[PDB]
């Protein structure tokens, strides 16, 4: 995949990034759990969406999970086409 990404040239001028990521612990108070890999140089090294599909299948199904919840009390006819808002208007209003 790294042979086909958009900015391979500026990434070709990027050297010594692994030792830089090792020395990042003396600059930032936030730790990097993925210090050992660079997505722009190594690529994406794992894929876990089949975990999502099989944990939906492991819990019986979508209908059993929705039976555990207040889905039928919403009056929505079908589950497909139902999106969550992350924050609220009042909650985003009281931000700063």
């Amino acid at each position: 995949n790294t042979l086909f990404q958009k900015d391979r040239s500026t990434l070709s001028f990027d050297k010594g990034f692994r030792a830089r990521a090792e020395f990042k612990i003396y600059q930032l108070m936030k730790s990097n759990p993925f210090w050992w890999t660079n997505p722009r140089h190594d690529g994406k090294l794992w894929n876990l969406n089949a975990y999502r599909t099989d944990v939906i299948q492991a819990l019986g199904g979508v209908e059993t999970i929705l039976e555990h919840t207040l889905f039928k009390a919403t009056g929505f006819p079908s589950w497909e086409g139902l999106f969550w808002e992350k924050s609220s208007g009042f909650e985003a209003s009281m931000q700063f």
Partner: peptide, 25 residues
């Protein structure tokens, strides 16, 4: 751009030499 092609090619042998560690020897 010829220069851009050259340095993207330089990325290409950089990735191949990264993949060919020990196999090249």
């Amino acid at each position: 751009d010829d220069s851009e092609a050259e340095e993207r090619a330089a990325y290409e042998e950089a990735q191949v030499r990264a993949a060919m560690d020990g196999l090249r020897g």
